[PDB]
Design a protein around this nucleic acid. Structure first.
Ligand SMILES: [Zn+2]
Lengths: 619, 165
DNA sequence: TTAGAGAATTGGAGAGTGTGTTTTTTTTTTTTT
DNA sequence: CACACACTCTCCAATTCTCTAA
């Protein structure tokens, strides 16, 4: 009889605790009838858990909060009984896969990892931390299935605090030691170990971080990945560890872990958007508005931002084998805004990647095979170019990569696939990725006398794959530098009402790009086709006259990509001479920047070859 | 979360102003541009200064103590308490001084253009000037940055470059 | 017709026997430097 | 070495079979 129960060594009545929690659920209303709304949400969604705020419990009833914190192992099952009783007193014929779990949580940490003490054992705590590792899924047996190997009579045994009461005899027949555990007829539930470090923001000065073990079960297992930051609420357990696996002597010093009751992630940061985006797309100069919205924190390079915008939108993928991906390269000294552009667009785009061409990079560009250290089994770590198979791959320090990595990037750009010839493994991985690269001069600062290729010292074959190439040189001009300095001091005097506005602009830019990618699929009009065709012939004219060469057919492919992307930006769904003219303009601006020899002007064969015509006749 | 005080030596031989700084030190601009002040701690033979240095070191050897310099420096504990008291402050730059900061930055920039072949500078130069002036404001224990702080930060950067040149 | 006293068979307590354990450096070689 | 597990054998006594009286 439930009314006779008290928690062991506690003097708290289980029935009274259940009634107090029931009236809490029935009458708490003011977070600004609260939790009956959550019960209805459970009823329609079908998720068997209820999140409850311990501060709400405290403000409703201090004593109930004290009981919950002190004796969670009994009080939380009491709350489960309370909530299930209420839920099935209402909604009488709704069906749930499981009984509801109450998941009490504190909004902020009550303790930190360094101050956890034996006084806190079997007590509900909340702590903040960063996740270091997450184990494979561990099945925990919940009900053992036994079958008699003599007469096939079966029985089921319930789990008593982690040990089985194995039947020593059969019931149907009477043979001894005949009941065998049928492992895959038994019942199991999910379990997982998590290793959690104290946050860098929470560590004391100059100390090595402390770490705790969490154990999650059932539905909380697969909610947290390594690198995440979480406020975890759970019961601080202490368990013995046996001195060696074949002996039941245990060390006097106990191991500790946290049974997870609740996770709250603390580093995470439709028609109501579509209606805005539809009219905003037909607003005038939306192209300029989006391009200027890109990277507000730096002084403006209009054509660089326009090219990055068209890279984000991309062409149209169709089938044959032509890449819709657009490749962009940025050049300039160290200390220019190119790395800020890379990091910004990596934060912006979905399926993005950011890595360094240098061999010291955090995640490599090429794919490799390694022994998973926590498992010892091989894992195929596909590089960033394969991980960004439907996004932008940002490559900082693009000049410093070794020749093997240059070959890998040549393969990825030409074929949009990465070959795997690892030991045993043979496969063709997919790398339909838009590469945004940032190179440096081999010298300290950009040599004006030498060409782009002569300064960055990358092969002309790989340079020829990029659709656009730009330079971040700053003039020795007061007209530019004075206004840049004004922009910089204003950026210091940035405030939160500007931060929110720029965040809203970036968010609607994200929604715009996602909505474009979702459905909008441009096609070529006849006038656009004629414009592209005569554009290729026009680019060939200037070189074919006088006997040199000024263009080659892959530039027509680049122009097609840019025109399709611009139609995608303006939501036209039909490519037109407007898009083709913008493509020609931006492509020729990129050529004016990158392909300009200091003596003879724009030379096309400086991309097809190392050096240029003047050098070829100087030697 | 620490401030780095680096001391380098030339890759080979003595320092040589004929060459560029990266040629002298053999360390890339990606490292060198992170720093706020690049100082050349020169050393030439100089008879009387060498005599005084040798007298100082010989006194240190024969007496195991610093010689009387006829100056009374602040004790180390007093200096520590002062720096804590002066770094407890968190000054702010007034917006009326933005134009003057702009003028100082652009004229330093344009002097680099006009007289030293446009040697490298960037927006982090202005940021470093502001950090230096705010450090000076902390040092003076005043919660508003001022003309004298900006002037001394500019002067400090200019004299460090003068030591280089 | 029930059940209780004497003899024989089966359950299991426990006495006795046997088993298993408590990153580091120098050198080579191919490829890449 | 020596301190826990793992396994077998033996003896002891508790239950059931058989024959008798209430
Ligand atoms: Zn059986």
């Amino acid at each position: 009889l439930g009314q006779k129960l008290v928690i062991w060594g506690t003097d708290v009545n289980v029935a009274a605790c259940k009634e107090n929690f029931q009236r809490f659920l029935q009458r708490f209303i003011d977070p600004l009838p609260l939790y009956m709304q959550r019960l209805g949400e459970i009823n329609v969604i079908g998720e068997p858990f209820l999140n409850v705020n311990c501060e709400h419990i405290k403000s409703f009833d201090k004593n109930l909060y004290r009981q919950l914190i002190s004796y969670p192992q009994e009080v939380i099952p009491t709350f489960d009984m309370a909530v299930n009783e209420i839920f099935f007193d209402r909604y009488p014929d709704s069906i749930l896969e499981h009984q509801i779990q109450v998941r009490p949580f504190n909004a902020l940490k009550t303790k930190n990892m360094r101050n956890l003490n034996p006084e806190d054992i079997d007590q509900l705590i909340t702590i903040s931390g960063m996740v270091i590792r997450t184990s494979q899924l561990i099945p925990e047996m919940q009900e053992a299935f036994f079958q008699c190997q003599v007469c096939a009579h079966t029985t089921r045994v319930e789990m008593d605090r982690g040990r089985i009461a194995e039947p020593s005899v059969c019931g149907r027949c009477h043979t001894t030691h005949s009941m065998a555990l049928i492992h895959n007829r038994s019942l199991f539930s999910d379990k997982q170990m998590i290793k959690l470090q104290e946050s860098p923001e929470d560590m004391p000065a100059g100390q090595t971080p402390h770490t705790v073990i969490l154990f999650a079960h059932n539905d909380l297992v697969d909610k947290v990945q390594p690198g995440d930051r979480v406020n975890v609420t759970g019961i601080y357990r202490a368990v013995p560890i046996r001195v060696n696996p074949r002996v039941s002597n245990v060390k006097s010093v106990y191991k500790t872990h946290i049974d997870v009751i609740h996770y709250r992630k603390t580093d995470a940061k439709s028609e109501k958007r579509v209606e805005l985006l539809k009219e905003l797309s037909r607003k005038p100069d939306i192209y300029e508005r989006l391009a200027s919205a890109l990277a507000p924190s730096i002084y403006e390079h209009e054509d660089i931002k326009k090219g990055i915008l068209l890279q984000l939108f991309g062409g149209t993928r169709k089938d044959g084998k032509f890449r819709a991906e657009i490749n962009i390269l940025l050049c300039g000294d160290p200390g220019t805004s190119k790395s800020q552009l890379l990091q910004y667009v990596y934060n912006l785009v979905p399926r993005g990647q950011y890595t360094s061409g240098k061999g010291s990079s955090a995640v490599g560009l090429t794919a490799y095979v390694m022994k998973d250290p926590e498992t010892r089994q091989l894992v195929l770590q596909t590089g960033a170019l394969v991980l960004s198979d439907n996004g932008i791959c940002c490559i900082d320090e693009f000049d410093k990569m070794n020749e093997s990595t240059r070959s890998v990037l040549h393969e990825v750009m030409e074929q949009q696939t990465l070959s795997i010839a690892k030991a045993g493994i043979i496969c063709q991985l997919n790398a339909r990725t838009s590469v945004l690269a940032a190179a440096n001069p081999i010298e300290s600062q950009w040599n004006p006398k030498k060409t782009t290729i002569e300064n960055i010292q990358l092969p002309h074959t790989l340079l020829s794959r990029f659709d656009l190439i730009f330079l971040l040189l700053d003039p020795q001009d007061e007209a530019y530098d004075r206004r840049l300095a004004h922009h910089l001091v204003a950026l210091y005097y940035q405030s939160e009402e500007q931060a929110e506005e720029e965040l809203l602009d970036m968010a609607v830019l994200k929604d715009y790009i996602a909505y474009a990618h979702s459905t909008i699929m441009p096609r070529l009009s006849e006038e656009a086709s004629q414009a592209l065709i005569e554009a290729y012939v026009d680019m060939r004219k200037i070189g074919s006259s006088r006997g040199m060469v000024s263009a080659y057919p892959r530039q027509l492919e680049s122009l097609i990509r840019l025109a399709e992307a611009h139609a995608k930006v303006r939501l036209s769904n039909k490519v037109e001479a407007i898009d083709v003219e913008e493509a020609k303009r931006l492509h020729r601006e990129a050529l004016k920047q990158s392909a300009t020899d200091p003596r003879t002007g724009i030379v096309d064969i400086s991309i097809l070859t190392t050096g240029m015509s003047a050098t070829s006749r100087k030697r | 979360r620490c401030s780095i005080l680096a001391a380098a030596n030339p890759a080979y031989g003595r320092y040589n102003p004929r060459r560029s700084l990266e040629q002298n030190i053999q360390l890339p601009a990606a490292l060198l541009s992170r720093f706020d002040l690049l100082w050349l701690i020169q050393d030439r033979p100089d008879r009387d200064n060498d005599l005084r240095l040798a007298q100082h070191i010989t006194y240190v050897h024969q007496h195991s103590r610093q010689p009387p310099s006829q100056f009374e420096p602040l004790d180390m504990k007093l200096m520590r308490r002062y720096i804590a008291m002066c770094r407890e402050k968190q000054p702010m730059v007034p917006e009326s001084l933005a134009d003057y900061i702009t003028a100082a930055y652009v004229e330093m920039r344009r002097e680099a253009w006009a007289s030293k072949d446009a040697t490298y500078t960037s927006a982090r130069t202005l940021l470093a000037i502001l950090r230096l002036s705010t450090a000076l404001a902390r040092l003076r224990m005043v919660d508003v940055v001022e003309k004298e702080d900006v002037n001394e930060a500019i002067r400090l950067m200019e004299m460090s470059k003068d030591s280089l040149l």
